[PDB]
């Protein structure tokens, strides 16, 4: 028994249409599931389909038990960034008596659609102090930042949602020791 | 849920043993032990099929397992190797819903020396007078630094409760330097709120840093504090 699903971080806007290729190669007729990991998780049964033609649903998402092509692909029709997660598709012989064959794992990277992107470089002073970092923020999530020497650190970008005004930002951190150390450089 | 694992983090020195505890109660005749590694996807370990017995799954080298009761799965490391640095994760099924329930997962780390682990440096830095004025938006910055093992958990407390929304903290922490074997780690983590709230002299801001390090029962010979599961903390309060 096998299991090959798509591999590499797979990165939609929110949204989007999602689609997870998953393929099997299997003895009998098998159950077949998708498990979703969550950052700083693990795994949790997602959906599955016990036989052939059965649509499991979940969350939004949904596979069908497809005999003719032996696959169990994952759709979605609108992303959301709360979506992004470790994707893994898996099979069982039925009853559940069998240890289960995982897929190797699809990295989902659901990133915002920013409306009014406005990238801007901010200095903020340590509270205690004579400390300072540099604040990217606010650009849009097709703006790559791009990766620092071993003095200066520069963060990857994160995503933020402030619900309280149904509003996302996208923002990376640098800071350095050195005397010479401008926010304007930084990123 | 309903899988408990034992510890949640350990820091080990090579050539040491221990032991991870899995706990179940929902009677699941079958118990599994799997290690997630970047790019190999979660390969088993061991697995049980009930009380007494343990099977080989596709890496079991290095490990042993014990199925003593069938509430409980002990894996075991004889000899710890820094290949053994791994997230472990352990699960459970019973046959006749048949589908695996996974527990939180154990970061292991496994070091040269002991010398080597470090709590963090905490520090916030306050929202830019730039940012408000133009967005009426205000950014926190924590920034946690200096720490080995990366075993670190990261949160936001405003007025003494745990915030989750308008926070974001680094995936991954990034390495102090990075040619090195050893290297201690950063992580920074940001709260947005608004600039009104931010400039009520009334509201309190927290970062806090629970770092997981050494136990009670772990030899410490060494000029400075013992690096124990401790909380690092840095505030600040609203600036009118």
């Known amino acids: 028994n096998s299991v090959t699903q798509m591999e590499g971080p797979v990165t939609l806007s929110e949204e989007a249409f999602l689609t997870i290729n998953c393929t099997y190669t299997?003895?009998?007729?098998?159950?077949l599931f998708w498990y979703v990991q969550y950052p700083g998780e693990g795994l949790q049964l997602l959906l599955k389909?016990?036989?052939?033609?059965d649509k499991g649903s979940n969350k939004g998402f949904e596979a069908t038990y497809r005999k003719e092509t032996t696959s169990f692909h994952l759709e979605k029709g609108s992303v959301q960034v709360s979506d992004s997660a470790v994707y893994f598709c898996?099979?069982?012989?039925?009853?559940?008596?069998?240890?289960?064959?995982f897929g190797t794992g699809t990295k989902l990277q659901v990133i915002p659609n920013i409306q009014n992107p406005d990238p801007a470089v901010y200095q903020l002073r340590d509270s205690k102090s004579d400390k300072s970092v540099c604040l990217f923020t606010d650009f849009d999530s097709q703006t790559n930042v791009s990766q620092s020497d071993s003095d200066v650190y520069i963060t990857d970008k994160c995503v933020l949602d402030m619900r309280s005004m149904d509003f996302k930002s996208n923002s990376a951190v640098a800071w350095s020791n050195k005397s010479d150390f401008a926010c304007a450089n930084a990123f | 849920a309903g899988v408990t694992q034992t510890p949640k983090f350990r820091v080990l020195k090579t050539g040491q043993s221990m032991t991870l505890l899995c706990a179940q109660d929902?009677?699941?005749?079958?118990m599994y032990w799997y290690r997630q590694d970047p790019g190999m996807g979660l390969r088993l370990i061991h697995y049980?099929?009930?009380?007494?017995?343990?099977a080989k799954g596709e890496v079991p080298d290095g490990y042993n397992v014990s199925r003593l009761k069938k509430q409980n799965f002990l894996l075991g490391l004889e000899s710890a190797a820094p290949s053994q640095t791994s997230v472990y994760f352990c699960?459970?099924?019973?046959?006749?819903?048949?589908?695996?329930?996974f527990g939180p997962g154990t970061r292991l780390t496994v070091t040269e020396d002991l010398k080597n682990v470090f709590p963090p440096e905490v520090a916030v830095f306050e929202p830019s007078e730039a940012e408000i004025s133009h967005t009426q938006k205000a950014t926190l910055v924590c920034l946690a630094t200096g720490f080995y093992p990366d075993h670190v958990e990261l949160s936001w407390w405003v007025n003494g409760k745990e915030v989750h929304s308008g926070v974001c903290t680094d995936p991954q922490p990034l390495k102090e330097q990075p040619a090195l074997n050893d290297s201690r780690y950063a992580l920074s983590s940001r709260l947005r709120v608004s600039a009104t709230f931010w400039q009520n002299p009334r509201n309190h801001f927290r970062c806090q840093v629970q770092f997981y390090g050494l136990s009670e029962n772990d030899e410490w010979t060494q000029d400075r504090a013992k690096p124990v599961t401790q909380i690092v903390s840095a505030e600040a309060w609203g600036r009118a």
């Open positions: 049980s099929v009930g009380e007494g017995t343990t």
């Open positions: 898996a099979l069982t012989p039925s009853g559940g008596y069998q240890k289960v064959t």
């Open positions: 929902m009677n699941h005749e079958y």
């Open positions: 389909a016990t036989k052939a033609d």
């Open positions: 699960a459970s099924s019973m046959p006749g819903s048949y589908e695996q329930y």
């Open positions: 299997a003895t009998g007729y098998p159950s």
